[PDB]
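Consider the following assembly input.
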Amino acid sequence: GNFNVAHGLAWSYYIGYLRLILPELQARIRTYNQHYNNLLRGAVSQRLYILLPLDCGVPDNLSMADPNIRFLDKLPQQTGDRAGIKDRVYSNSIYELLENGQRAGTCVLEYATPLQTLFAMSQYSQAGFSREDRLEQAKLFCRTLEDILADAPESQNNCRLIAYQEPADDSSFSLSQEVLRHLRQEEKEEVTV
Amino acid sequence: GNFNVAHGLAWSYYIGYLRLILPELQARIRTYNQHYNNLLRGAVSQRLYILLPLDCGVPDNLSMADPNIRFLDKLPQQTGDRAGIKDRVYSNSIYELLENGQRAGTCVLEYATPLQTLFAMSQYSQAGFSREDRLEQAKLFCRTLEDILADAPESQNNCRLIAYQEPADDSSFSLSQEVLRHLRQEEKEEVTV
Ligand SMILES: Nc1nc2c(ncn2[C@@H]2O[C@@H]3COP(=O)(O)O[C@H]4[C@@H](O)[C@H](n5cnc6c(=O)[nH]c(N)nc65)O[C@@H]4COP(=O)(O)O[C@H]3[C@H]2O)c(=O)[nH]1
Ligand SMILES: [Ca+2]
Ligand SMILES: [Ca+2]
């Protein structure tokens, strides 16, 4: 019946994590851009880019997904407040996106960790949760998280969801291209509006 | 038609937390009890006690809801793995339960963290989530988690849910006394079985 784990997962992810880290993340990115743009020959986008593989495949490191997605630098932390903000642990990692060995873009990137739960659920037989259930909830997770972020206080502008199914043959899918296409569209939006 | 956050919250709580902390819990408690017995003739119960206040009120200090519930120690981490078998580092607290100033029991005690999500949602206006909704979802949370632990590999024997609805009239609920009942029933079971 009407059992959708994705509903709770998306709400939990926003309330217990994204809501808490997005303002501080944008603040650190801005500062980083101020001190290091001369060094970067560009700018890190201020949107957290969230990877949502619909196959729920989350690797411990990003480069084993795509050798054109490569660690660049660390985002410095917040400054000497320590007044209640430091609860979650999130990635201070900036990635560069490569095209032909050349840096084509830069962003803060991370996977949507609740997809791990759906994967775990699908390997846990007592849950009675099929691969087909997993994909269905993964999609529902995306839709739900999207709706939440649409009405969220300036957080729609604070992150970008990158949902993607991967070729059920084996074409060499390019995640780096997927991300770059969003980066280019974002800069285009930022500049034509 | 049915949006039930509690479903995903309970699955997320078992998958992302209980499944990982519980298999090694009783070993951690056992090695603490060796010292606890030798040093104070103490015995800490072997089950994780999970407070589920139906009103979703989670304080950042247990002792603030009851000074008959007195902090004793952190439960020390496991051994062998440099990685941790299943854990990075789980903070778990051991508490003494007091009756008329006297130590009457000892257990690893903590609130069900997903109740905070339910509480935050009910203060988040974009959620259209009322305090009546929260309670119904809190009940569903307990029910769902219970069903999960019942099918779960020995994790059911590893923990005990303490779900309580507090009297609206600001009557004299004793949380310490509620916990002691469970502790006294646990000892009765282990001693009769
Ligand atoms: N990248 C990143 N993502 C984060 C972080 N914190 C939370 N998230 C994401 O948001 C989800 C919801 O977290 P939650 O509301 O704290 O909800 C948690 C919480 O209620 C509970 N839980 C998890 N770890 C602990 C713990 O160490 N102690 C206790 N008492 N509860 C825990 O189980 C729920 C499910 O946890 P998850 O499966 O891990 O699911 C997490 C996770 O996917 C973070 O610091 N970094
Ligand atoms: Ca993949
Ligand atoms: Ca209460």
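The beta strands of chain A are 48-53, 69-74, 93-99, 102-111, 159-164. Ask yourself how this observation constrains the way the partners meet.
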